[PDB]
Amino acid sequence: SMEQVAMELRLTELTRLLRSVLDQLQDKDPARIFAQPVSLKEVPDYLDHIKHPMDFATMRKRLEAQGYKNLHEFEEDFDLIIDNCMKYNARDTVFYRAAVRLRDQGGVVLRQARREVDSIG
């Protein structure tokens, strides 16, 4: 159908918007603390602590498969990165502090992306 294609053009454009959003969020992690999954070879007990791991490479794979239906699902994954870190790591660690700074700095990007998604439809 002609509609399914119109739909696919919007999903593709949403993917396009979310890609720029992801790049902007990832720039706020210059240390690359959140770039890749926590290694289960190096933290073998990780899944006993964190039940839904997330990281920026995993979000990117989902994004490029057009696996994000709306901005809300995308935010869910971003929030997992931050919240998992703030639980596993103590307050006085470089990792926890990195998560706080990503949360704070990402808020601004996400604020405008929500306006852009509502605005563009």
What gap in Å lies between CA 72 and CA 5, rounded to an integer? 23
Domain extents for the chain?
1-121
Q: How many CA atoms lie within 13 A of 30 on its CB side?
A: 1
1-121 in CATH: which number? 1.20.920.10
What the block records as the tokens of 71 is 């901005």
What gap in Å lies between CA 97 and CA 85, rounded to an integer? 9
What gap in Å lies between CA 48 and CA 105, rounded to an integer? 29
Q: According to the entry, how was the structure determined? A: X-ray
Radius of gyration for the chain, computed over Cα atoms and rounded to the nearest angstrom: 16
What the block records as the tokens of 66 is 């057009």
Measured at the CA of 111, the angle between CA 72 and CA 24, to 5 degrees, comes to 90
**Final resolution, Å:** 1.6
